[PDB]
Design a protein around this ligand. Structure first.
Ligand SMILES: [Zn+2]
Ligand SMILES: [Zn+2]
Ligand SMILES: [Zn+2]
Lengths: 98, 47, 43, 168, 256, 370, 239
């Protein structure tokens, strides 16, 4: 299945060249279809976010909090954008200060 | 082909010529440009 | 760090978490003009 | 029996055909250069260089025939099916003025270009025919020369109420 | 592509900024708006002020039907079950519209009667109303009187109630009440057939594939389409991976 | 009681024609379900004050409104020419009490705006209104007077920026044409583009003049469902509220985008059509919820009753209580509108492409030097 | 004389029944593309010369495969594909830059985005137009659009040696790339997943960085200030 291989190497190359911003490489596992490469990527991935496989009936990914469950729709092109989080910070600090 | 290579060479040098940006202002909003330590000035004395 | 991972739905009353582009049927949703026009590493 | 229309005028006529028919654009009816005005300008310019009194007379009577035929002809074989609404509106607005004082060179040239097929049915003397046709040729040349002043520059879009009115 | 961007001297950031705006050439006003003549740009609006004139738009008009896209000329074909449900709804609307209009007019005229009757007796005998009886919404009253009586006795009864209200009101209230009771009895007598039609047709009105899936599954079950799928997947793999795809698989099913 | 509910007890008695889709009877259905759910206490009920010719000539022309005041189904034969000039007579039929119905709806909208201005309320509900196809000089699409535009003008007297969100299956052509050249009103409309009624609504219609990038059009294909609509609706509205921060929202809660509609071609349910209202309520901005389309009265009544309850805060029961219109509701008698199958056509690539384009347009308002 | 010509013209016109205008056949058949209609209208003569649109195309009449031009997929990742009526190309109706909501009408020819006539100013050629071959080698003003087609070893290797070598080289490049990336993990995590709380720091404790000041410019451009003093860093109030 050369498509999954090419997709994997493309995602890792994008993470190298800084296009897909590590939350964005942890997802784009819409190519799940198998639990063994995830269990094998365990020992190489570490944030406290190692994947989690419970019977791949559910593929919820760890974090320092309790960890998000995978979305039904595909890992829809989540790239990072700085002005958004900056405006969210402005709003939150204004609210807390008030 | 030989015309486009010469046509783009002149246009490219003209863009690099104007790419050198060194300006000082206070209270224009102009672009999301290269030299904006300006905004540090009007927001500073109050904060 | 938990609310940053699959954040394509803005939660309820907040400005967007992450930005969205297209993925031209690629099975690796990166591949784009972003991919084809970014540095990997007579003319 | 044939005429020599410049290519610029041919292009302009086809562009106006398209604009009025398919794109739903009309011409502002009250013109700044009048049909009578252009007729008088060309008449003055040609007489100022004419040679003998017989030629003066035939040119004068030719111009008179031209203006009377325009005034008698415009509303019968010179407009498209998308302009009859505008025509009746203009007749209601100015029922005392006349077409020679209302319309413009954009329609005078339709008259000129269509003259051959009309002289096809008419069968007067070849001398009169050739005089009139040479006069039309010189007029077309003068218009395409002074394009900048006589011809309109941009067309006008018909409003929704106008389009619902015409509907054809 | 990187070589072309190097020739043009365009950074990838600036290319991504310029792409969406400089690829497709559309007019600035959009593909559906167009400018107006100067004549009809100042039609009267006797209620506007300077603040409204500054904000509202009077220059660019939209295309309702005059472009190549006139309007919606393709009506969505519905399933017979949805059509039956629509017919049922329409029947109910007819009955209920008539009953409720009659009832509303009965109530309004009863209010007028209560006012003029609480009024003492001298003014009771010498009272009068105006054309429309002062109802803020006279259309319902006019329509219901027309319908209940006729296209001919309507004017007679109207003038009668206009001139002599205190005597005429009880009779018209009685007549409207009687006809309303008749309509209500007919509605109660017709209800169970409606319930039956609704029951029989409800679920199939959501089950739209019950009608539209046979003609779409015959294609997937056919053989020519399957062979074509195989061939096109082979071509696609050969175009994508030229070095590989001599060891690839067109289809990989999992049977667990 | 911060929800001001407008309802005139006459609105349900106006009749369009023999078999017409638009029926003002739905407002009466909604009100009966409300009064029997007991929301009448948690709401604030105001019988509206009728509009005037001077109030409607703010957005419409004097000749057009005078025609609407003078027309009658009998004198229509003599008024024939002006009819075909003003678009009244084919799909916007001339019926009894046309001016009265228009006055009721426009008065509801103007009163909602005045309530939001005076501060007596923060949410103002008017279902009789929402006619968003009316234009400056002609009726269109079962609409005669643009109460949305009149309401926006009344809001702008006190508020500096106003957002208008259309989730009717058709384009908000009238309101867009009204506010096409201004930056104080931004019009975001989600609609079905292609071979459909208004014809207008390309992704490229983005305004001209000062109102460049202040019309937002989201075209969609046949058969959108709850998840797809959410994925296109939440990002775009969040980005709008970020870049163009409004002080007041006007939400056209049109329910022809539901499933099983005589004229719509969408697949939303009661939940998918109400997550929109919830997302917009979640910003704590003053808002006017106006009605709109909707041509299947049972679905319309139940969905609008649920949305009224959700704005008031109360979570209504699941069984319909005893009302005078019970038989209208099907063999289940529940407060819900399920979706059908109607295979979708909106691919993720299509939705993502249109969303990215809209986001770039909204961002250009603050990037992109002046 | 021409007086009599005028008399005969007047007699003809007031004797006959009015009709609508049509310019002579010479002017009409002059240009290329233009042509009359059923009711004297102007219609361009570029329509489908063959005669609902077949949504999914898989095989071509020439055996050439049907793959989209931009994404190289096969009309099955998306339920519809489009065939350009001018070149041998196929496009997904979703891959075009403004994605087409509905497929075009099967009457009018459709033109893919890979042609130069989309950005040329329209012109008209006469229908007697000898294609001139311009000899000027460089510097020819040509109005951008009227330049027609720019008219002017068998090895028998038979080995898989180079194919095997290329496969091993690809695997080696992949191995090195994966090694570098999976070592830069545990730092990608820290600098990309906690990146949402450091902005909170430089917002709360208001330290001026470039992006903070750009956000303040964004808020000023939203509020539309003119000439008054900027209030403060935390008190511009689109709160
Ligand atoms: Zn609608
Ligand atoms: Zn494609
Ligand atoms: Zn092509």
């Amino acid at each position: 299945r050369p498509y999954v291989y090419s997709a994997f190497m493309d995602v890792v190359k994008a993470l190298h060249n800084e296009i897909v911003d590590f939350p964005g490489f942890i997802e784009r596992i819409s190519v799940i279809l198998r639990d063994y490469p995830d269990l094998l990527e365990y020992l190489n991935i570490f944030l406290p976010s190692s994947y989690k496989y419970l019977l791949a009936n559910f593929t919820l990914q760890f974090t320092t909090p309790s960890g998000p469950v995978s979305t039904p729709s595909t890992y829809v092109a989540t790239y990072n954008d700085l002005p958004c989080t900056y405006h969210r910070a402005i709003g939150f600090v204004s609210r807390v200060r008030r | 082909i030989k015309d486009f290579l010469y046509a783009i060479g002149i246009e490219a040098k003209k863009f690099n010529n104007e790419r050198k940006k060194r300006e000082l202002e206070v209270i224009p909003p102009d672009v999301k440009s290269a030299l904006l330590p300006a905004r540090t000035h009007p927001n500073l004395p109050i904060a | 760090p938990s609310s940053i991972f699959f954040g394509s739905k803005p939660p309820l009353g907040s400005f967007p978490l992450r930005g969205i582009q297209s993925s031209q049927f690629t099975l690796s949703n990166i591949s784009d003009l972003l991919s084809q026009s970014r540095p990997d590493n007579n003319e | 029996h044939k005429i020599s229309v410049p290519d610029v005028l041919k292009l302009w006529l086809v562009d106006d055909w398209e604009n009025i028919t398919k794109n739903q654009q009309l011409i502002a009816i009250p013109r700044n250069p009048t049909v009578r005005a252009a007729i008088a300008a060309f008449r003055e310019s040609k007489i100022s260089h004419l040679n003998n009194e017989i030629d003066v007379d035939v040119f004068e009577q030719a111009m008179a025939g031209l203006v009377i035929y325009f005034n008698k002809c415009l509303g019968n074989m010179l407009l498209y099916r998308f302009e009859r609404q505008q025509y009746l509106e203009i007749r209601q607005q100015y029922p005392d003025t006349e077409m020679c004082d209302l319309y413009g060179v954009e329609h005078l040239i339709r008259l000129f270009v269509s003259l051959p097929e009309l002289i096809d049915r008419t069968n007067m003397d070849s001398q009169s025919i050739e005089c009139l046709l040479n006069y039309i040729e010189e007029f077309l040349k003068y218009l395409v020369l002074h394009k900048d002043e006589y011809f309109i520059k941009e067309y006008q879009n018909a409003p929704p109420n106008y389009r619902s009115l015409v509907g054809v | 592509w990187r070589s072309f961007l190097s020739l043009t001297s365009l950074s990838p950031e600036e290319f991504l900024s310029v792409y969406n705006s400089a690829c497709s050439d559309f007019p600035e006003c959009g593909p559906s708006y167009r400018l107006l003549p100067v004549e009809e740009r100042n039609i009267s609006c006797s209620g506007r002020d300077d603040f409204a004139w500054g904000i509202l738009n009077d220059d660019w008009v939209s295309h309702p039907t005059w472009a190549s896209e006139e309007s919606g000329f393709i009506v969505q074909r519905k399933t017979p079950y949805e059509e039956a449900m629509t017919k049922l709804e329409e029947e109910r609307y007819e009955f209920d519209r008539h009953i409720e209009a009659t009832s509303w007019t009965i109530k309004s005229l009863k209010k007028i009667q209560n006012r003029i009757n609480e009024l003492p007796e001298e003014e009771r005998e010498t009272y009068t109303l105006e054309e429309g009886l002062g109802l803020p919404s006279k259309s319902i009253y006019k329509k219901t009187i027309k319908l209940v009586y006729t296209s001919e006795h309507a004017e007679e009864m109207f003038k009668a109630l206009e001139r002599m209200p205190c005597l005429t009101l009880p009779l018209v209230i009685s007549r409207l009440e009687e006809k309303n009771e008749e309509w209500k009895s007919v509605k109660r007598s017709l209800q169970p057939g409606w319930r039956s039609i609704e029951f029989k047709n409800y679920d199939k009105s959501l089950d739209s594939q019950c009608v539209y899936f046979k003609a779409r599954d015959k294609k997937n079950v056919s053989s020519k389409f399957l062979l074509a799928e195989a061939d096109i997947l082979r071509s696609q793999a050969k175009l994508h991976f030229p070095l590989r795809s001599r060891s690839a698989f067109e289809f990989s099913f999992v049977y667990d | 009681k911060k929800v001001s509910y407008f309802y005139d007890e006459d609105v349900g008695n106006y009749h369009y024609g023999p078999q017409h889709p638009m029926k003002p009877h739905r407002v009466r259905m909604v009100h009966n379900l409300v009064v029997n759910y007991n929301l009448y206490e948690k709401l604030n009920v105001i019988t509206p004050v009728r509009a005037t010719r001077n109030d409607m000539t703010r957005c419409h022309t004097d000749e057009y409104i005078e025609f609407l005041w003078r027309v009658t189904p009998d004198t229509m034969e003599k008024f024939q020419p002006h009819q075909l000039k003003f678009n009244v007579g084919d799909d916007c039929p001339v019926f009894d009490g046309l001016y009265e119905f228009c006055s009721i709806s426009a008065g509801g909208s103007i009163g909602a705006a005045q309530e939001l201005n005076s501060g007596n309320a923060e949410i103002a509900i008017n279902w009789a209104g929402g006619l968003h196809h009316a234009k400056k000089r002609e009726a269109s699409g079962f609409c005669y007077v643009n109460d949305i535009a009149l309401a926006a003008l009344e809001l702008l007297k006190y508020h500096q920026r106003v957002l208008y969100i259309d989730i009717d299956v058709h384009h908000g052509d009238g309101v867009e044409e009204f506010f096409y050249t201004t930056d104080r009103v931004m019009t975001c409309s989600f609609h079905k583009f292609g071979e459909y009624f208004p014809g207008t609504g390309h992704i490229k219609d983005t305004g001209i003049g000062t109102g460049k990038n202040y019309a937002v059009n989201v075209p969609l294909r046949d058969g959108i469902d709850d998840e797809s609509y959410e994925s296109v609706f939440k990002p775009v509205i969040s980005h709008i509220m970020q870049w163009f921060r409004p002080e007041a929202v006007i939400l056209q809660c049109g329910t022809d985008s539901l499933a099983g509609d005589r004229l719509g071609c969408f697949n939303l349910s009661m939940k998918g059509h109400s997550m929109c209202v919830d997302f917009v309520k979640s910003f704590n901005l003053p808002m006017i919820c106006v009605g709109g389309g909707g041509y299947t009265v049972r679905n319309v009544a139940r969905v609008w009753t649920y949305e009224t309850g959700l704005l008031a805060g109360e979570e209504l029961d699941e069984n319909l209580p005893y009302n005078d219109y019970l038989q209208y509701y099907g063999p289940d008698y529940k407060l819900n509108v399920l979706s059908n199958n109607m295979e979708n056509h909106n691919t993720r690539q299509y939705l993502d492409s249109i969303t990215s384009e809209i986001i770039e347009n909204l961002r250009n308002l603050s990037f992109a030097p002046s | 004389t021409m007086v009599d010509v005028w008399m005969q013209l007047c007699t003809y016109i007031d004797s006959h029944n009015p009709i609508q205008f049509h310019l002579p056949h010479s002017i009409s058949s002059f240009f290329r593309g233009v042509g009359s209609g059923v009711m004297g209208e102007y219609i361009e003569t570029d329509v489908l010369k063959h005669l609902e649109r077949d949504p999914l195309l898989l095989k071509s009449k020439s055996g050439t495969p049907i793959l989209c031009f931009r994404c190289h997929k096969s009309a099955l990742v998306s339920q519809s594909i489009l065939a350009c009526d001018y070149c041998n190309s196929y496009w997904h109706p979703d891959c075009l830059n403004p994605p087409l909501a509905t497929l075009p009408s099967n009457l009018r020819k459709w033109k893919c985005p890979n042609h130069s006539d989309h950005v040329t100013p329209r012109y008209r050629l006469p229908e007697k137009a000898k294609v001139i071959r311009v000899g000027l080698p460089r510097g020819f003003k040509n109005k951008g659009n009227i330049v027609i087609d720019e008219n002017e070893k068998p090895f028998k290797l038979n080995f898989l040696e180079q194919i095997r070598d290329n496969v091993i080289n690809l695997r080696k490049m992949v191995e090195q790339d994966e090694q570098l990336c999976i070592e830069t993990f545990s730092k990608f995590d820290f600098y990309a997943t906690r990146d949402c709380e450091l902005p909170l720091r430089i917002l709360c404790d208001v330290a001026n960085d470039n992006l903070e000041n750009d956000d303040y410019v964004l808020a000023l451009r939203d509020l539309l200030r003119i000439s008054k003093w900027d209030p403060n860093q935390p008190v511009p109030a689109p709160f």
